[PDB]
C-alpha cells in the first residue's frame, strides 16, 4: 500500500524532524522555529500525537503555523509518489 522505503519512525531524530519540517513548512533553517521544535523532543512516531494542541503550543501562537504543520505531517504519513492524473 505505502510500505516502500520511508525513513523508519524509529530512526527519526530531532535534527531530522526539524530540518525536514521547516524546509517544507514555511521558512528555512534560520528562524527560531528550530529552537522551539528542538526543545520539545518529539519523535516521528509521536508527530501524529502532537495534534493542533501540541503543534500550536510549539508556536508563539499562529494558526497558519500549526495548521500547515499538522497537515504536512498527514501527507508524509499517507506518502505521495505519483497517483495524481
Swiss-Prot record:
SAM domain: residues covered: 4-85
Oligomer status and interactors: Interacts with STE11 through the respective SAM domains.
Chain's role: Involved in growth arrest during conjugation. May interact with the G protein alpha subunit.
Protein name as catalogued: Protein STE50
Residues of the full protein shown: 27 to 108 of 346
Misc remark: Present with 1670 molecules/cell in log phase SD medium.
Species per Swiss-Prot/TrEMBL record: Saccharomyces cerevisiae (strain ATCC 204508 / S288c) (Baker's yeast)
Amino acid at each position: 500500500g505505502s510500505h516502500m522505503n520511508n525513513e523508519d519512525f524509529s530512526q527519526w531524530s530531532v535534527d531530522d524532524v526539524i530540518t525536514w519540517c521547516i524546509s517544507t513548512l514555511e521558512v528555512e533553517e534560520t528562524d527560531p522555529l528550530c529552537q522551539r521544535l528542538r526543545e520539545n523532543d518529539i519523535v516521528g512516531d509521536l508527530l501524529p500525537e502532537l495534534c493542533l494542541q501540541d503543534c500550536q503550543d510549539l508556536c508563539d501562537g499562529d494558526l497558519n503555523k500549526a495548521i500547515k504543520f499538522k497537515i504536512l505531517i498527514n501527507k508524509m504519513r499517507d506518502s505521495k509518489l505519483e497517483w495524481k492524473d
